[PDB]
């Protein structure tokens, strides 16, 4: 589990969205696994705008903190998990890293801020959903 809350944007993982998220809909896109809700009180977040390739993300299935290389955001086979069938997935970044189920919606950040939110994991990857792209987050 886990959001971005940046101004008043909740940035939450399309899977884990909730009927109050729904209600409340700003923007969502399956194939980026994204969904974005309005929030009444403003976030403490800060949206890096940067073409970064390392930082640091969060792995709630070991209470920790991880280095990582990643992947330009891409369009990516990812095979089935407990949340999506086998399919691809668009503005999907890789690193080699643990992730579950559960992990999805840690940070990735770097010296800028968020880069995103674990989407994928499996076979030794974990997969974050970019929000680099969606300056429109950054106001209004
Ligand atoms: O519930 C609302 N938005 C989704 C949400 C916000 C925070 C959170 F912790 C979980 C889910 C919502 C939005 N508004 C209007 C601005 N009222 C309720
Ligand atoms: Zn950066």
């Not at 080699?96 to 559960?102: F, I, M, R």
């Not at 950040?109 to 959903?129: D, E, K, M, P, W």
């Amino acid at each position: 589990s886990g959001a971005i809350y940046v101004g008043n944007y909740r940035v939450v993982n399309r899977h884990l969205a909730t009927h109050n998220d729904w209600a409340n809909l700003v923007w969502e896109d399956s194939s980026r696994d994204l969904l974005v809700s309005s929030t009444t009180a403003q976030g403490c977040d800060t949206i890096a705008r940067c073409d970064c390739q390392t930082g640091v993300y969060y792995c709630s299935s070991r209470r920790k903190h991880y280095p990582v290389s990643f992947s330009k955001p891409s369009l990516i086979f990812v095979e089935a998990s407990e949340y999506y069938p086998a399919r691809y997935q668009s503005h999907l970044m890789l690193a080699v890293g643990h992730s579950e189920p559960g992990d999805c919606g840690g940070i990735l950040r770097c010296q800028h801020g968020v880069v995103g939110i674990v989407s994928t994991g499996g076979n030794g990857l974990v997969g974050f959903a970019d929000v680099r792209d969606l300056l429109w987050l950054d106001e209004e």
